[PDB]
Amino acid sequence: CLAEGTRIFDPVTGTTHRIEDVVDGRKPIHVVAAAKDGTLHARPVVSWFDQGTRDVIGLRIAGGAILWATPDHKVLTEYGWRAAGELRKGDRVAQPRRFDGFEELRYSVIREVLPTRRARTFDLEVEELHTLVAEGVVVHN
Amino acid sequence: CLAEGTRIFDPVTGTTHRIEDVVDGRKPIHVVAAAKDGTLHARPVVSWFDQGTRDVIGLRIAGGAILWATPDHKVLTEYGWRAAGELRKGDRVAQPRRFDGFMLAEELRYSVIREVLPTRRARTFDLEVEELHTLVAEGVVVHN
Ligand SMILES: [Zn+2]
Ligand SMILES: [Zn+2]
């Protein structure tokens, strides 16, 4: 599950949403989803889940992003899908390359793993691809 | 997460595996996976997860199979994904079946839940299925 505050970009509208707002309002937004080959595609959210308050850990990525998710949340890495709790400094996660062009994914090293924290968590179902970019990182849905 | 003992059907070999054996041996078995349009395909397991001991509930499906999963595990229904813990007796779940006369040949069919069993503690596991992110466990299409 992803923590409250997680930013999700809707490529069809240009709006960046906070996951808790998407779930609380059952907003049918589109997200940046990753296909098996690494290409990105806009896919609609079809299910919304308020997963309650749970423990989450943080992955500070080279570049500035800090992904907060439960230890069992799956993240796309250089070695495929791995649980956030299994990752450590040095491991690389998948991130979309800048949309302005200045092929579509890049792997960034985890700067540091942050200690467990209590937070409201959520989940979304993304049609067909079951993935989405959250806090600048390709994560599992 | 799925409980120890969960039977996973490999449509390629025809073999049925216990999920804990698949995870403990990181076996790249194939599973019956459902695509967006409901069609079924053989897809390989690419990741294995030992999720530790968690609370799991049980759903006995028409036919006799019993799916033991955490209440938050997503199950495929004609209305989309639903948390196992929200399903009740009589609700229908996706259960692939081959033509009996009464891309894979299996057709996506639906079967009713005959009984909901009380929560219990059990070792749990999870699997990642290439591309489609779904698989058949205890004959029911569940979320991966
Ligand atoms: Zn999904
Ligand atoms: Zn998956």
From Swiss-Prot, chain B:
Superkingdom in the source lineage: Bacteria
Protein name, entry field: Endonuclease PI-MtuI
Transmembrane spans: none
Species of provenance: Mycobacterium tuberculosis (strain CDC 1551 / Oshkosh)
Gene designation per UniProt: recA
